[PDB]
Amino acid sequence: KGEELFTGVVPILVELDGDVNGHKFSVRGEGEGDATNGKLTLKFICTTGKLPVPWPTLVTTLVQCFSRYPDHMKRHDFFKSAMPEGYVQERTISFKDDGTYKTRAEVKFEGDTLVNRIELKGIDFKEDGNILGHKLEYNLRVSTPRWERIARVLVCLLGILLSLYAFHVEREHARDPSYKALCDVSSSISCSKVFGSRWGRGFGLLGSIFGNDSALNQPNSVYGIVFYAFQLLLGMTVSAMAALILMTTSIMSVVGSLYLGYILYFVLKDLCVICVTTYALNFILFVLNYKRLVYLNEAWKQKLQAKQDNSHNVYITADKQKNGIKANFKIRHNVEDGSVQLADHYQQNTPIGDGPVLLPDNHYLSTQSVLSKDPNEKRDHMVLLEFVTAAGITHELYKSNSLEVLFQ
Numbered sequence: 001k002g003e004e005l006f007t008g009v010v011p012i013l014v015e016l017d018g019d020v021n022g023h024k025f026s027v028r029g030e031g032e033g034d035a036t037n038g039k040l041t042l043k044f045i046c047t048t049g050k051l052p053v054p055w056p057t058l059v060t061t062l063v064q065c066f067s068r069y070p071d072h073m074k075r076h077d078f079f080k081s082a083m084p085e086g087y088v089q090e091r092t093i094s095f096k097d098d099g100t101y102k103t104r105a106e107v108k109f110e111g112d113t114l115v116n117r118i119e120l121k122g123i124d125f126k127e128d129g130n131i132l133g134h135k136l137e138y139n140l141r142v143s144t145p146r147w148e149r150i151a152r153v154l155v156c157l158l159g160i161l162l163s164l165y166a167f168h169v170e171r172e173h174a175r176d177p178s179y180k181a182l183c184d185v186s187s188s189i190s191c192s193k194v195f196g197s198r199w200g201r202g203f204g205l206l207g208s209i210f211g212n213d214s215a216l217n218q219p220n221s222v223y224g225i226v227f228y229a230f231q232l233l234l235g236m237t238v239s240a241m242a243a244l245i246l247m248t249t250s251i252m253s254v255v256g257s258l259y260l261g262y263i264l265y266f267v268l269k270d271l272c273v274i275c276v277t278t279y280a281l282n283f284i285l286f287v288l289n290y291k292r293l294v295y296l297n298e299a300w301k302q303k304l305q306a307k308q309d310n311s312h313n314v315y316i317t318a319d320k321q322k323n324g325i326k327a328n329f330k331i332r333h334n335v336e337d338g339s340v341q342l343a344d345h346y347q348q349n350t351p352i353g354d355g356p357v358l359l360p361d362n363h364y365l366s367t368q369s370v371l372s373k374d375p376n377e378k379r380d381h382m383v384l385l386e387f388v389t390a391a392g393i394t395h396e397l398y399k400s401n402s403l404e405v406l407f408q
């Protein structure tokens, strides 16, 4: 079925020609592939000299037909169905705040060899950018875990909404005596009585400790806006300086939330869901910044590169209109200063020959990469080892022994 062609070892040859802002280069890689275990191993050499771009930015471009599909999901393996005829893989890689890659590739069998021929076009790249300036780390690890990166963005976005709304209640209630906010309903459930109180501007202190009309003296929500924004955008760089600056400010959040929360319950005897959540949001930020400092202390443990945290998902969906598939995912390169260079991926696959192919359901390919070097090779090279396995398929469980044994 073409899936029979991947039950053993398959030699792999890749070739890539491209020009990026005028700079041309050619890459040739050689190796084999084990689809039964979801593994590939290749050694790429830039035949023209020095690669004008960092090696990790070309890992995604340089044969998903060696993915391991469990016996459940082998119904959804489009890549092996299109073989030996092959498929055409076009991509668009957009680097945030920089240029974009434009690739087209033909993946096909040539004798007993799986061959990938690629053409790349790099357009509108900044020279001293993280790409054409060679500023990226030589790996494909994730500096911040996925489920923690999502926790940061969601809580900081929620913190800005709540603080901006708290600023809305403070400024209008001070100007309009007939104004009632959504949290102003009954006495003991009143925003205006909390923000309009003494402790609502500069935490009650630092006014009459400062001029009481100064610029520092400000509604407490304003400090949150600056804090949540500062935590959101610097919180993606994983550095030494950027780590303690996040932990320093996050401590100031917990000492201010504890102070403010005390006055809310015991002094004012009030209730404010916007205040309680912002306290919770600030406590979540504290423990997330605490993780990174132990991520930095255990640096030796984390140079391993092969950990399942360093994996990337490639979400696939069908394309019945063209008898193919399309996919999207994101890659976050590690730049030498600690921040992140984002790279948007948009993929489209179309079979070469005209035969029965297997259009899949919405699943994804979990991928991991290991980028090594060779001391004997003097040219600009890269040793690669990848791991692709499919996931995202189910098995509801009415027929479960626990529920069934209760219902006899």
Ligand SMILES: CC(=O)C[C@@H](c1ccccc1)c1c(O)c2ccccc2oc1=O
Pocket: 162, 163, 164, 166, 167, 194, 195, 197, 199, 200, 201, 219, 220, 221, 224, 256, 257, 260, 261, 263, 264, 274, 275, 276, 278, 279
């Ligand atoms: C939820 C807000 O943005 C306003 C809130 C607050 C919470 C944490 C840090 C800054 C600001 C707020 C209140 O909790 C509050 C509670 C008691 C007394 C005064 C308060 O003023 C506030 O602005």
